[PDB]
Structure formats: structure tokens, C-alpha cells
Amino acid sequence: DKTVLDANLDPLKGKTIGVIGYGNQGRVQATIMRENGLNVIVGNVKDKYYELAKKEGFEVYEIDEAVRRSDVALLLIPDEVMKEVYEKKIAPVLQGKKEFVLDFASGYNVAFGLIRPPKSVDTIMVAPRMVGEGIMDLHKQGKGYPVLLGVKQDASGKAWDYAKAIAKGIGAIPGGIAVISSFEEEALLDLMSEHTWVPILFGAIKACYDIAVKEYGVSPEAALLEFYASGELAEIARLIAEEGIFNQMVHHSTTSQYGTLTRMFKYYDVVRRIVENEAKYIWDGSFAKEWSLEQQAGYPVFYRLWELATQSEMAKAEKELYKLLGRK
Amino acid sequence: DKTVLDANLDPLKGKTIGVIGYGNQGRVQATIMRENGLNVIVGNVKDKYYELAKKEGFEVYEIDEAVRRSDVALLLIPDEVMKEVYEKKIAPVLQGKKEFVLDFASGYNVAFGLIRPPKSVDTIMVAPRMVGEGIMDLHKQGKGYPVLLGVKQDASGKAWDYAKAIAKGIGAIPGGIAVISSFEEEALLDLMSEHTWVPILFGAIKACYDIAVKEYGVSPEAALLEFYASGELAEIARLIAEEGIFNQMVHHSTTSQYGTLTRMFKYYDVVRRIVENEAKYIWDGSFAKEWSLEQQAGYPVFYRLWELATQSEMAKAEKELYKLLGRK
Amino acid sequence: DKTVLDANLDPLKGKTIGVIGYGNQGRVQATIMRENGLNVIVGNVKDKYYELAKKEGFEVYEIDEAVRRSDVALLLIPDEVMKEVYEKKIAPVLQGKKEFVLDFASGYNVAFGLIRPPKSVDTIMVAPRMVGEGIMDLHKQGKGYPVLLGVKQDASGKAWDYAKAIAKGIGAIPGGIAVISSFEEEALLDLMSEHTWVPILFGAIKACYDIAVKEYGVSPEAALLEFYASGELAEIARLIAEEGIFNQMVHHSTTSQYGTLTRMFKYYDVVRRIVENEAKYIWDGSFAKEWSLEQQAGYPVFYRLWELATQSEMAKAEKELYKLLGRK
Amino acid sequence: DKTVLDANLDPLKGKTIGVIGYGNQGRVQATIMRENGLNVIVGNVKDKYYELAKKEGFEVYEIDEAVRRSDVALLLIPDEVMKEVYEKKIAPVLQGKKEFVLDFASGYNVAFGLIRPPKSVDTIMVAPRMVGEGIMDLHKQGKGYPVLLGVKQDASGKAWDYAKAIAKGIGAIPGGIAVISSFEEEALLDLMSEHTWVPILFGAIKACYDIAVKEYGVSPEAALLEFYASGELAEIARLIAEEGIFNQMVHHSTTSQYGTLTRMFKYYDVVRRIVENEAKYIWDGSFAKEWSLEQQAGYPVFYRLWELATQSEMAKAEKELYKLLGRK
Numbered sequence A, B, C, D: 001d002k003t004v005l006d007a008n009l010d011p012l013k014g015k016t017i018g019v020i021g022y023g024n025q026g027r028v029q030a031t032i033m034r035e036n037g038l039n040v041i042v043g044n045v046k047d048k049y050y051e052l053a054k055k056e057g058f059e060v061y062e063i064d065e066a067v068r069r070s071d072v073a074l075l076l077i078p079d080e081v082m083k084e085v086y087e088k089k090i091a092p093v094l095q096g097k098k099e100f101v102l103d104f105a106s107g108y109n110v111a112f113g114l115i116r117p118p119k120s121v122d123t124i125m126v127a128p129r130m131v132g133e134g135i136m137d138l139h140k141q142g143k144g145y146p147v148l149l150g151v152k153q154d155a156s157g158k159a160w161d162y163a164k165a166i167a168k169g170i171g172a173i174p175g176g177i178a179v180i181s182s183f184e185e186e187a188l189l190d191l192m193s194e195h196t197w198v199p200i201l202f203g204a205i206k207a208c209y210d211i212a213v214k215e216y217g218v219s220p221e222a223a224l225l226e227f228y229a230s231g232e233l234a235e236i237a238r239l240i241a242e243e244g245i246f247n248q249m250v251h252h253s254t255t256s257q258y259g260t261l262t263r264m265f266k267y268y269d270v271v272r273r274i275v276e277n278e279a280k281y282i283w284d285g286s287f288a289k290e291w292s293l294e295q296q297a298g299y300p301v302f303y304r305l306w307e308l309a310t311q312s313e314m315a316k317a318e319k320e321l322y323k324l325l326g327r328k
């Protein structure tokens, strides 16, 4: 009832498009927009990404120059830095424009009140559900992916059509779909995913390895092969996406079904408590504070935790093994 | 140091192979063994799988007949029923043989002392790391998968070569590898996987859905798209298998990296406790008892939990959605 | 809205009826069905109940013979044994029939997946709300009782009429009523009753006796007379059924009303917790496992608990007293 | 095995040395380097320390000028501010140099990823084990002190010799020794000292004073004399450094030995727990965040805690007393 499976592309036509930030997402999205008959110019600071963009047949102007030239702008730089960059390079140029469309790939900065623009511009959002490195793949298979879109500020009365045209232009639909929502919901959901069932999974795997090796005298090779060094999880996830999370298990053994179901219904309350805590922590705005301050300090915790993860026993063993298998 | 990347196939040659149980694994393995120039006959009870095997150009004899004819037998029926079936249909025919090789796809029945054969036969094990429905795929891509192999009883002094020839014959190597271990370790690892980080993941996802819908007024469609209805997890898992569990995250956003790492190191002790409890429960032999009794009663808990899972709100919503997307 | 107060009886007419199990319920139901112009034959194993049935003018055939002869069958044997008896004596004869109606007095075996029949038969349920020894009584007063009915499998499109005709035939309606429901609900409710407020009541009575005697120097006779050896509870329960559980108390003293209400609202949370625990334990299917295994072991706990109950002080005292009063 | 007791000094010769920050450490180290035939110029902002350096026969250039002139630079300013100062005054001048040696007196900024230089420079560390005011003393006694040294980045293949020459040049060896380590270990150790057994000691002393005065009616003078106003602790610490922490106690009374040992082995677990917590807090990088943010806010907690410490009863009493004794 709140979905789209295809839409138009023409309101983009004639206009000029500016993709600020040629990284994980800017690279892919700009490439596809080019392939869809949309002349896109890139705006980036002077670094290696500048070299790259300039090297892939892109007119890499400076940010403000791009905004000047462009009627549509895509703010594809980290969720952590498009505030310093906003009022210092965009908001001024914005006081000059009157017809301008501004897009995000997330609701972080705006849902938490870090970027509040004026009544002159159209303020939208369109967010994929991939990592970018997994979008090149689907595009090379004539496929599409899902997205979420939402609008905060309707200056021209035409927001939704612009959003849907963008969706079609970057390669989401046709082939996938898109749903309408707020910014709050998008932010909440992305962060719940990033905070609840990803880290829990990783910690459980790590704990299984540690235990099996240090209390049951197992060989690292076998542990790694069983837990994640094999492509089992990938096939399971594909079957989940194709058939259903539960129906999928009809391809497992009954032993697996039974153990999984029992232990799932056995541990539900604990993870429920955890999810409650984290979703509350987010809904308030505490995490955004935590994170912006982590920047302003210089990313110390970031650094140390990367180090601790890559200097763990499991990671060294994985190094040796992946070496053995020729995997890079 | 404990690995193989290719081996021979000839000791299989001349002999006859019997695949008892033409299901998830028997189907695939028998098919591939056929394709590798190994004449395989199938042994199964009279049901739909009998129809299937007989229909795919297989000489579907009765079990005992297959054992008679066969010099090698593969016991690919559920981990729950190859005891009634063992002494009643195999052990007698076995008292007649003297040169016979017997294979398992797991160490459950033998590690826990439910099947102890006599000194006359070779008792091995060879176990994949896939669900079967995900092996047809890799075989249709000229690829291989990992396995684990181990031997309990060496009657002919030639166990390991037989095991490795089987590995090569069913399609594991070349393309993947195989490692040697006990039966205890294999069982422990498979069950730890099936009991710790799969059900935890599923329960966390379910809890996220429930919370987001019942305490923050979210639309089911968006929740499902974010959490699992999208193919994000599949791409993440592929990148994990390819590059590494941590290095993979270099393709994410820094926000995701930070939240994930923090919450991973924050909740490690809890999941560690859980894994300890479950691994202990297994190492003792309690779960095998639990499970065999669940059979002998008639699978009541099994039934009820399937019902509860498929009659939850999330599953109905997924039904509607997958319908909308054309997914079956 | 989901009720019936009378219905037809003719679809039963012409057909033959088989009552498998001539015990607490089979005796009574078969007797009444006879009295309602329904020729019923009995099917039972060779024991004292066989003698009884054969002695009360019943054609006591063997089970399979009864099923052959019969177009309708009633499975009135314990909830614990109609699985061994099902596939070994019924399911085979069933593969031969195509028009056959099968009835239960409970949803235990089918709700938990211990008996799943084929698409050929009509699978219903009709369950009273009495103990059998209390139905002879009401029938000897031209009265009726309540029941619950539900159907799992509609093979002929006529289930409900068959169920209602059976209800009318055994003596429920007219005089009482009947309601439609699932099997799950019936099972849940019967077991909640049998697990929550019956045993709690008995334990409270026993504790009152023990305390009054061992800490306040009371005579056993008086304790027994007050608590249950008197017919007070019977009259209270009759008034409850007639007027209402609360309105009834208008015939008590105000002292009783006050104490009862206060202590009821005072202890509600505790019993609520207990009921939650037990209903959960049931909804999962754990109790069915517990119980089937108790059989397969040989009913040890059953035996020991009967012994402990009949060898308690209260029971001996009740023996002496009931002897004094001439009560058997 | 990882120690040095003397080394060379010549690689310093010919080069020019720049000491950025003429404070607690820069003053002392620069003075000694002068005395060792090493021409050192000072780089500092315009304040009283500028006056001082310029007044002690130092060419006090501006920071960038010093870096230009200098082939070796010592970054002896607070651990809290050499980031603003780094990229704004050093990193630019650094892009011009190719042969440059850069030294720290600690591993804080670099171990936590607040300062990551380019592959062009040599990045070392050399850290004393004194407070500076206690180094002038030992140098005026022809003695030396210990240090720790470590290198993060070897651009010229000559790091260690440079580090050891610096050690010899500032007055550590000969007379003391030096050990090699990472940056992580140095940081961890310094901070563990500053967080565990210093503050615990001070709090215990304060508590003893408070208790003795407010619950046993003692005179402040006596409490202060016993606990710290006497030079007992100094002599104890000297004997510890000379003989050993335990052997030292052979000069105490047996009463003291007994009480000390008993209560030491009695309270070990508690302090162990505390040390665990704090070392973990550090290893993650949380404290560095805490501290950099304390700066960015304006040092409020710092200020308030100084006030609370100097406005406590004990401090006023110490004021009066030290006045009485002529101590300043």
C-alpha cells in the first residue's frame, strides 16, 4: 500500500546533478546515473577520491562550484562530517538558490537536528539497503535492490516524484521496490540493525571459537571452517531472501530445526531486553552525541578496537588459512 | 598442516556404492557420484523418495539388498533413526561381510555410543559444510566446498585414502579442502553452530521487529525490508567468506563500524556464558537424550514450535510482502 | 453467537457406530446412544471391560472388525495409548475406507501432531465437561450437559452436522449447549483446569489440615469435617453454577464475604504467575512429551504419588471417619 | 636482555636540535642537552615560558622557525594539545622535510591514533621515570635515571641509535638504564600508575585523617605528623629502591611486618578488581576520549576538584602546620 515498483525519470532530465562525495556510495550511484542518461558532475576535496573521479570521466569541480552548477545535489559523504561541510560550503551557496533539491542517503543528520535548512529548498531522503560493493554486482545482473525514501521539506510540491525519479535513476527500481517513511524510522531501523543482531552474531562466533579451542582442544582450522570460513551463511541468507526465514529451514536437517527452534524460543527474552535498551538509547539521541564526540576527540576508541579485533587469535588464524586457500 | 586440496579416486573404482537415504544429501551426493564415473545404487524404503530415486535412473533396491550388492555404503538418513534401522537391517547383513566400508555424514550416533560396529568393518566419517540445496549451486559453477573427515575404526589400514577418495567423488575437492578430526569435535562444532549463533540471531531479529512495531509505531513493511527481507545479509556473508569477517567492514560506513565494534565488545561476556552452558550440555550427552526421546514421544514440541513460528505476526506480514514482490 | 441448543440426529441413522473403548466414557456414551435409537457395536481388547460390554447386550467385536463394520467410530480409550493402537489397528483399515467419520473426546493427540490422518476421512472432535459418573446422574434427571466441538479435517463438507448430531445422540443437547472451537483451545483449557486450580485447592486443604493439627493441637475429626468431609463445597458449587460465582456469596455471612474478597485480591498476582508458567509449558508441547515418556517408562511417578497420597495421615483419618459415618 | 647502560652521542653531533615546549621537561632536558655539547634552540609561544627560555641563553624562535632550522625536534608540550599544534604548525613544515627525526616523551597521542605521520620521518619515543623537579637533583649528584624508549616508524633504518643517543644526551645513561618497548605498553603503564596506586594511597590517607579526627577525637597536628607530614614515606621509598620492596621491611618492627603482610594478602582481591577495571578502560581508549573532551569543554571538573582538594579540612590544617614548621 506504501510501495512503488517503477516510476518516471524525466524531471531529472535537463537539470544538472551534483554528487558530493565519490566514495562507497558516490562512486556507484554516480556511475549508474551516468549510465541512465543523466549528466552528473562530481564535487570532492583534493585527495585520492578526487584522482579517481577525475580519472573515470567525471568533471570533478570543487564542492561549491558543483553546487552552483547543479540543480540537484547528493550528499554522499560520511554521516559524521556533513555539518562542518554544510554551513561552511553549502548553506552560503544555498542562500543564493531558490529552486534546489537536496538529497540524503540517511536520516541521521536531519532527524537529530544537526542540519535544518530553510523553507526555500526541497529536502528529501532516499536510502538503499546494500553496502555498495553489493550493488555493482546486482547491476551487473540486470537486477535491482530495495530502498527507503522520505521527505522532510516540500518547497515545490513535487518532492515525491523527484525522489522516485532518483530511485529509478540510480538503479533500485525496476527490479526492486521502495517504501515511504519518515526520517526517524529510517534512522532507528538502520541503527537497530547495526547495533543489535550484527555485533551479537560476531561476538557469538568469536566466543564459540575461543571456547572450542581453549576448553575442548580443537584445531583452529576446523573451528574457522565450521563457523564462518565456509560459505554456508551466504547460502542460508540467500534462501532466506528467496523463500522465507523459516520455510528456508525445510532444507536443513530435523536435528538442526529442533535445536534452532528450541534455543530461539529459549533466549528470546534476553535479546529482547537488549534491543529495548539500545532502541531507547537511540530514540533519545544519545548515540549521535557519543559519535560526534568520538569524532571531535580524534577517533581513539575506533582505532583501538580495530587493533584489538585484527590482533586477536582468530584473525591471525584466519590470515594463515585464507593464505592457504589462496583467498586474499 | 592437517589439510588436503586434492586426492585420488580409484579405490572407489570397481567397487559398488550404496547410498541409503535419497533425501537432502543422498540426492545430491548420489547425483554427483554418478557424474564422477561411480556406479551408485540407491537403497530406500517405499515412499515418495523411492519414486524419485527410481525416476532419476537409479536402481532403487531395498536397503538390505543394496548392502548385499554394495562394497561401500553411505548412511544418509536422519541422525535420529539410523539406530532402529541399523541393527534391524544393517548389522545382520554386516555379520556376513568381512571387507566393508561404512560412512557417515556426522558423528552424532557414534560419538555418543548409539552405533558401535564390530572390528570387521572400516568406520569413517565425511561431513560437508553446506545445506545441500547450496551444493547443487556450487557444482553448477565448477566449484567445491569444505568438508571434515575422521575415522573411528581402521579395519583394512586404508581408511584415510577411502575417505579422501569419497571427498573427491562427491564434489568437495578439488576447489575446496578437507580437514581431519575426531567424531567428538565434528559433533560438538555442528551442534554449537546450530545452538548458539543461529537461534540468537533469529530471536534478535524477531525482537527487533516486535519492538519497532509495538513501541515506536513502525510499518511492518519497512521493518521486514531492513532486517531480513533484503539481501543485505547475503552480500555481507559473501564478503566475509571472501575477505575476512573484520576486513569486510571496510566496505561499511564508519558509523556502522563504530556501533558494531562497541556493542560487540560490550555484550561478549553474556553470549560467552551462554555458549559455555550449551557446549557443556552437549559434551555430556544430554542433548542426544533429549532428542531421541523427542522422537520416541512423537515430535510434539517440534510440531508446536513450527506452528508458533509460522503463526506469528512477522510470518504473516512476510507472507503478504513476498506475495507482493512475486517471491514464492 | 457460537452456540447450539439443539440439532438433528438423522445423518447418524442408517449408519453403524463403533465405540472403541468401553470405559468411563465409552460405557456411558454407548449406553445413551443405544437409548437414542442408534445401533452401536463395541470394539475392545480381551479384558474385564470386554466382559462388561458383552454382558450389557453389546456386540463386542475386535477393534478392526468394529472399524470394518462401522461407518462412524469413537476413539474413547486413554489419551496416552491411541497411537500404538492407531497405526497398528486403525490406519491400515483406514487406507481401505473412503467415507469414514472419526471422532475424539479431546484434542490432545491431534493438536500435538501425534495422529495426523489422510485427506480421505472426516476428523472431528466432541468433548464433554463432566467425569462420566456425573453424566449418568443428569441423564437420570432428564437433563443435559455442556460440550465443546471442533473439526480438524472436512472431507465430505458435512463435518459440523455430524458433530451436532453426535452431541444430540449422546445426551448433551437438548438441555445443555455446545460451542465450536479449535483443538488447541480445548486442549489448553482442559489441561489448565487439570493443572492450576484443582491441585492448588487440594494442596491448600492438605496444608490447612497439617498445620491445624501439628501447630494448634486440633482433633483430626474436626479438621476433616470443616475442610472437605462435609458437603459444603458441593452446595457452594451448585449455587455457583445456578446463580453466579460472586452473586452466590450473597448467601454467606458478611464476615466470609469480606475475608474471601480481601484475600482473593491479595493473592491474585502469585496464582497469575503460576498459571502463566503452566499455560506456557503446555502451549509449547512439553507436557505431552513428559507424559508419553512417563508411559514408556512404566508409570513409576504415577505409582509412587498414589502411594504417598493414600499413605498420608489425612487419608488414614478420613478412612476411620468415613468408616464411622457408614460412608464407603 | 632488553636493556642498555650506555651508548653513543655522535649522530646528534652536527645536527640541530629543537625543543618545543620549555616547561617541566623541556626546561630540564634542554638545559642538560646544552651541558652535553649539543646546541639546542627552543620553540615556544609568546608567554612567560618564552621569557624564561630567552632569559636562559636560548634562541627562542617561533615553533615553525625552530622546525625549519632543526634536524631533530622534541615535542615536550602537554599530552592534550599537541594535535591542534601538530597539523597547524608541524605537519605543513613536515611535508617539506625528508630527513627528520621526531621524538615524544610518551605514547599517548600516537598509540591512540591522534597523530599519524607520513612515511618520510623517523617516529620514536623516549620517556623518563621522574617528575623533572627530581631530575635536576640527580643530575646535581652525577647520577642517572631510568627511561623507556620505543619506535613506531623507521624511515632511515637508524631509529634505535638515535633514541639511545638522545637518552645519553639528556642525562639518563650512564648511571641508569633504558628498556625497549612499544608505545602501547608505555602508555598503559604510565596511566595504570597514575590511576591505581597513587589515588588509592591519597584517598586512604585522607580517610584515615577524617576518621581519626571525627570519630576518635584526635588532634589534627598528630594525624598529619603520622600520616604524611613526616618524611617517613620518603625513607621507606628510598630503601625500597635500594634493597627491595620486601627486604626493606627487615628494618621495621615485627609488629609492622605482621600487620602489613596480613592486611596486604587480605585486601588483594579488591584492588585487583579495581586495577582490572581501570586497565580495561584504558586499553579500549575511553580515557583518552574523556580527557580530550575535558579540554574541549574548558577543564571544569579539573578546576572544581582542585578547589575541593585545597578547601578540605586536612589542607587548611597542613597550611597552619607547615607555617609553624617554616616549611613554605
Ligand SMILES: NC(=O)C1=CN([C@@H]2O[C@H](COP(=O)(O)OP(=O)(O)OC[C@H]3O[C@@H](n4cnc5c(N)ncnc54)[C@H](O)[C@@H]3O)[C@@H](O)[C@H]2O)C=CC1
Pocket (backbone or CB within 6 Å): A021, A022, A023, A024, A025, A026, A044, A045, A049, A075, A076, A077, A078, A079, A081, A085, A105, A106, A127, A128, A129, A130, A131, A132, A133, B251, B252, B253, B254
Ligand atoms: N556501504 C555504505 O557505507 C552505506 C552508506 N550509506 C550512507 O551514504 C553515505 C556514504 O557513506 P560511505 O561512502 O560508505 O562513507 P566513506 O567513508 O566511504 O566516505 C568517503 C567519501 O567521503 C569524502 N570525505 C571524507 N571526508 C571528508 C571531509 N572531511 N570533507 C569532505 N569530504 C570528505 C571523501 O571525498 C570520500 O569520497 C553515508 O552517509 C551513509 O549514511 C547508505 C547505505 C550503505
Ligand SMILES: NC(=O)C1=CN([C@@H]2O[C@H](COP(=O)(O)OP(=O)(O)OC[C@H]3O[C@@H](n4cnc5c(N)ncnc54)[C@H](O)[C@@H]3O)[C@@H](O)[C@H]2O)C=CC1
Pocket (backbone or CB within 6 Å): A251, A252, A253, A254, B021, B022, B023, B024, B025, B026, B044, B045, B049, B075, B076, B077, B078, B079, B081, B085, B105, B106, B127, B128, B129, B130, B131, B132, B133
Ligand atoms: N542439509 C542437511 O540437512 C545436512 C545433513 N547432514 C547429515 O546427512 C544426513 C541427512 O540429513 P537430511 O537428508 O537433511 O534429513 P532428511 O529429513 O532429508 O531425510 C530424508 C531421507 O531419510 C529417509 N528416511 C526417513 N525416515 C526413514 C525411516 N524411518 N526409515 C528409513 N529411512 C527413512 C528417507 O528415505 C529420506 O530419503 C544427516 O544425518 C546429517 O547428519 C550433513 C550436512 C547438512
Ligand SMILES: NC(=O)C1=CN([C@@H]2O[C@H](COP(=O)(O)OP(=O)(O)OC[C@H]3O[C@@H](n4cnc5c(N)ncnc54)[C@H](O)[C@@H]3O)[C@@H](O)[C@H]2O)C=CC1
Pocket (backbone or CB within 6 Å): D251, D252, D253, D254
Ligand atoms: N624502626 C623500628 O622498628 C621502630 C621501633 N619503635 C619501637 O622501639 C622498639 C624497638 O623495635 P625494634 O628495635 O625495631 O625491634 P628488634 O627486632 O630490632 O629488637 C631487637 C632487640 O631486641 C632484643 N631482644 C630480642 N628478643 C629478646 C628477648 N626474648 N628477650 C630480651 N631481649 C630481646 C634484642 O637484644 C635486640 O637487641 C619497638 O617496641 C617499637 O615500638 C618505634 C619506631 C620505629
Ligand SMILES: O=C(O)C1(C(=O)O)CC1
Pocket (backbone or CB within 6 Å): A252, A253, A254, A255, A256, B128, B129, B130, B131, B190, B193, B194
Ligand atoms: O551443516 C549444518 O550445520 C547443518 C546440519 O543439520 O548439520 C545443515 C544445518
Ligand SMILES: O=C(O)C1(C(=O)O)CC1
Pocket (backbone or CB within 6 Å): A128, A129, A130, A131, A190, A193, A194, B252, B253, B254, B255, B256
Ligand atoms: O552503514 C550503513 O548504514 C549500512 C546499512 O545499510 O545498514 C551499510 C551498513
Ligand SMILES: O=C(O)C1(C(=O)O)CC1
Pocket (backbone or CB within 6 Å): C252, C253, C254, C255, C256
Ligand atoms: O460455614 C461457613 O464456613 C460460613 C460462615 O460464614 O461461617 C458459611 C460460610
Ligand SMILES: O=C(O)C1(C(=O)O)CC1
Pocket (backbone or CB within 6 Å): D252, D253, D254, D255, D256
Ligand atoms: O613508625 C612506624 O610506623 C614503625 C613501627 O614499627 O612502629 C616503623 C614502622
Ligand SMILES: [Mg+2]
Pocket (backbone or CB within 6 Å): A190, A191, A194, B253, B255, B256
Ligand atoms: Mg548506517
Ligand SMILES: [Mg+2]
Pocket (backbone or CB within 6 Å): A128, A129, A130, A190, A193
Ligand atoms: Mg542499512
Ligand SMILES: [Mg+2]
Pocket (backbone or CB within 6 Å): A253, A255, A256, B190, B191, B194
Ligand atoms: Mg547438524
Ligand SMILES: [Mg+2]
Pocket (backbone or CB within 6 Å): B128, B129, B130, B190, B193
Ligand atoms: Mg554444519
Ligand SMILES: [Mg+2]
Pocket (backbone or CB within 6 Å): C190, C191, C194
Ligand atoms: Mg483431561
Ligand SMILES: [Mg+2]
Pocket (backbone or CB within 6 Å): C128, C129, C130, C190, C193
Ligand atoms: Mg475437562
Ligand SMILES: [Mg+2]
Pocket (backbone or CB within 6 Å): D128, D129, D130, D190, D193
Ligand atoms: Mg610515569
Ligand SMILES: [Mg+2]
Pocket (backbone or CB within 6 Å): D253, D255, D256
Ligand atoms: Mg609500630
